[PDB]
Amino acid sequence: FKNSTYSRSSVDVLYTFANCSGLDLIFGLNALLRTADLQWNSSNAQLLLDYCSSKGYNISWELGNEPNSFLKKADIFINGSQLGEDFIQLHKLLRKSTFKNAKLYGPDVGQPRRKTAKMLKSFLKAGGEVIDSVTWHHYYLNGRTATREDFLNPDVLDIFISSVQKVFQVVESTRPGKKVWLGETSSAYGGGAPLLSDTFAAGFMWLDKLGLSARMGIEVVMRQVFFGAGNYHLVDENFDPLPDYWLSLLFKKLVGTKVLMASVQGSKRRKLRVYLHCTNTDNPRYKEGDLTLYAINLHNVTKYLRLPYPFSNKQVDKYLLRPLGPHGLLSKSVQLNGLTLKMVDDQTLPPLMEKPLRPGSSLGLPAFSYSFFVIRNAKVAACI
Amino acid sequence: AAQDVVDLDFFTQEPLHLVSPSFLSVTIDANLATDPRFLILLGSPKLRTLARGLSPAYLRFGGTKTDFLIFDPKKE
Ligand SMILES: O=C(O)[C@@H]1[C@@H](O)[C@H](O)[C@@H](O)c2nc(CCc3cccc(Oc4ccccc4)c3)cn21
Ligand SMILES: *[C@@H]1O[C@H](CO)[C@@H](O)[C@H](O)[C@H]1NC(C)=O
Ligand SMILES: *[C@@H]1O[C@H](CO)[C@@H](O)[C@H](O)[C@H]1NC(C)=O
């Protein structure tokens, strides 16, 4: 990797995209600009903050990407303590600016390996007080070697649980109560796995990651990428949405902020994965107390879910996602309850239409499929 | 078949966690800023319709190239 410059025009393009889209821009600053004593040289960042200030740009900040690999990337080793001091410097800059109540996140470390905890721990000790969230990164696979079986493998999905537990071990030891974010996450590194990271098959790892993240106390999950060269893009090079886009839209429609818990009875149950939230009641179809279950079936046969008492006679809306043929799990097209999901036009998303089930029916979930189920009139007081 | 029927347990007593409304957020890799078509692409009205669909969300601009990008107030 070699240095590049970017323009006011570049910043304007990115800010406008975010602002017109209703998204909150987080901008990563260059942490490899160093003084002789290997302090962070903040002077380029001061240029950028002044320009953003001058334009009234409402922006949040990070400093550095994956510091534990700085020696590999640039032959510069920055320990966690120094990075903490750098974040303190950046915090002071932000507080002396129009960005005085702008947010700061870091340090965007990779997932826990033999000794990546030392950097995150010494970083949180040193600079933990000035960050609004702890950001780390997670990938399951190498895009070069990943197989279709890896994408469908419950043992691959489950390794994520230990990554999360190891991160929370470091944070609880140094900054208990600090919000933990996945600041960069996807299926496969090296730009994704061709014909896997951009297909219906990607949805197992994406929905399971969202389920486990919410269940285990991760507050924000940042999908690599919305759009770009990587096969793990949610939108392709023709600006067409891939199955993970539709999955992400359906998740946002149905899933509320209050996380609950579902589990399957039986000795091992790794292939039937289940998650439970309060329903998103912005939807006028649903009301206070409604539940959203979501479920992944990685068995090669249909499974039938029985809701526990007292929800076994409730009206349930099914939102079942399956690939549009002929490429099955390797399809870049997806059907919701047997209707293909396509933009109505370049300005217009389709409705996402439920399939009501007859009250008292088991929830049918076909082989290698994922579904949302809204339990109507659930009247769960925890959901207010 | 009987073996294909599975019973769910639910915990509903209290919220176990509260995620952000922005729980599902997205990135643009810092490397996209080196693409000459950067202005064309993020200008796409179609792309903006799709991004507005994910609102609310953080958009994180970052990646390996974060630590190899330099603001030039003079260029372009
Ligand atoms: O490679 C990428 O696609 C992106 C790149 O576009 C982005 O600009 C850059 O920020 C990035 N970091 C990672 C994660 C690299 C990493 C670190 C540690 C472990 C990782 O994953 C495994 C390693 C060994 C076994 C299994 C997973 C991956 C992936 N990526
Ligand atoms: C970490 O790095 C700083 C700055 O380069 C150095 O001066 C210091 O001795 C190192 N500290 C530890 C605790 O290793
Ligand atoms: C499911 O997996 C087993 C191999 O374990 C295979 O023998 C069986 O025929 C498969 N069933 C279907 C419906 O594909």
Side-chain angles (χ1 to χ4, degrees), chain A residues 178-207:
Chain A
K178 187 72 78 184
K179 294 315 170 152
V180 180
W181 287 12
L182 274 168
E184 196 195 301
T185 195
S186 207
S187 50
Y189 63 80
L195 273 192
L196 295 172
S197 288
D198 44 6
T199 67
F200 181 88
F204 304 100
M205 275 169 163
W206 185 220
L207 186 57

Side-chain angles (χ1 to χ4, degrees), chain A residues 1-8 13-14 17 20-26 28-32 44 48 62 64-65 70 108 183-184 210 214-215 217-226 238-240 245 249 252 257 259-265 269 301-306 308 346-347 375 380 382, chain B residues 1 3-29 31-34 37-76:
Chain A
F1 284 97
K2 262 309 201 73
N3 283 330
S4 314
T5 54
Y6 58 98
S7 62
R8 283 167 293 111
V13 162
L14 183 56
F17 177 65
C20 288
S21 298
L23 311 180
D24 295 295
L25 184 50
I26 301 167
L29 297 163
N30 188 332
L32 285 191
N44 195 233
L48 175 58
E62 291 168 357
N65 182 85
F70 281 166
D108 284 274
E184 196 195 301
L210 293 167
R215 179 60 190 97
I218 302 299
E219 201 195 25
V220 165
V221 182
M222 299 179 190
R223 172 53 178 277
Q224 184 88 346
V225 295
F226 175 58
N238 310 325
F239 306 122
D240 295 319
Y245 178 89
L249 196 64
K252 282 187 177 276
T257 50
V259 189
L260 296 171
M261 167 185 175
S263 58
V264 298
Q265 297 185 173
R269 259 101 153 67
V301 307
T302 301
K303 294 308 187 182
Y304 304 85
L305 316 179
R306 295 201 299 217
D346 290 0
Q347 290 300 298
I375 305 169
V380 173
Chain B
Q3 94 266 344
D4 302 318
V5 181
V6 166
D7 288 310
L8 299 186
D9 300 325
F10 282 6
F11 184 92
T12 62
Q13 295 183 159
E14 58 182 345
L16 292 173
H17 297 292
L18 183 65
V19 292
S20 165
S22 298
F23 178 60
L24 207 162
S25 290
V26 294
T27 74
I28 303 289
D29 197 88
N31 203 41
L32 192 65
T34 74
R37 292 152 54 235
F38 186 57
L39 194 147
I40 307 163
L41 300 175
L42 298 209
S44 165
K46 189 176 189 196
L47 191 54
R48 290 174 179 212
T49 297
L50 288 168
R52 257 192 310 282
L54 302 185
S55 188
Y58 296 98
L59 173 63
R60 180 257 189 165
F61 178 77
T64 297
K65 191 80 197 172
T66 289
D67 296 308
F68 304 90
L69 284 177
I70 296 162
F71 181 53
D72 189 342
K74 297 285 95 81
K75 86 174 281 173
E76 213 158 336

Side-chain angles (χ1 to χ4, degrees), chain A residues 352-371:
Chain A
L352 301 179
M353 289 289 96
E354 72 278 355
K355 186 202 193 204
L357 302 179
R358 67 149 195 83
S361 55
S362 59
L363 279 37
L365 191 58
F368 304 112
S369 81
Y370 33 91
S371 190

